[PDB]
Structure formats: structure tokens, C-alpha cells
């Protein structure tokens, strides 16, 4: 499981790191709109691993 656990934790974390360079923005709104794209997958991937 450890393999498919930091996997999920890495996608959220580093996608914020993208928004803090691609379009320089550290604040809370960068973390929110980053998982506007990611959240769609996060629930779908949960249903296919199930």
C-alpha cells in the first residue's frame, strides 16, 4: 500500500509547486485552483481502485 499511498500524496503537493512558477503565486488560491483539475481524478481513481 505504501507505494500506492505516497503516490496520491505526491500528485496534490507537486501540482501546487507547478502553480508557484508557471504562474508565480504562493497563496491559498493557488492551492485551491490547482485541485480544480486534480479533484476530478482523485474521486474517479478512488472508484477504480475499489
Amino acid at each position: 500500500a505504501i507505494g500506492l499511498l505516497v503516490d496520491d500524496a505526491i500528485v496534490v503537493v507537486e501540482n501546487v509547486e507547478r502553480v508557484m512558477a508557471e504562474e508565480g503565486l504562493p497563496p491559498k488560491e493557488a492551492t485551491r485552483k490547482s485541485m480544480g483539475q486534480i479533484q476530478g481524478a482523485l474521486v474517479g481513481i478512488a472508484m477504480v481502485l475499489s
Binding site: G40, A41, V43, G44, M47, V48, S50
Partner: protein, 50 residues
């Protein structure tokens, strides 16, 4: 063999094994539901096949 001689499989083995009959049925339904769950969050007839 001669008359009055039958047989019966005794006696741990089995009822239905694992790499045998079972595995085909397990992987079978695994594909059926994976396709359905790649549609509640996607909407197409192409995304699931990828």
C-alpha cells in the same frame, strides 16, 4: 476397475482453486466495473479504453 468400486476425492482438495477457475472470474468483474467508474467522472466512449 472391477464391479463394486467407485471413488471420491478426499480430502483437502478442494472445491474451486485460485489460479484456476477463480482468477478468470475475479479479473472478469474487475474489468466490468473499472469501465463503468471511468464514465461517471469522464463521459465518453474512448476515455475508458485508453
Amino acid at each position: 476397475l472391477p464391479t463394486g468400486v467407485g471413488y471420491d476425492w478426499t480430502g483437502m482438495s478442494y472445491q474451486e482453486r485460485l489460479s484456476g477457475n477463480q482468477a478468470p472470474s475475479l479479473y472478469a468483474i474487475s474489468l466490468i466495473v473499472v469501465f463503468l467508474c471511468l464514465a461517471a467522472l469522464y463521459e465518453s466512449w474512448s476515455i475508458p479504453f485508453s
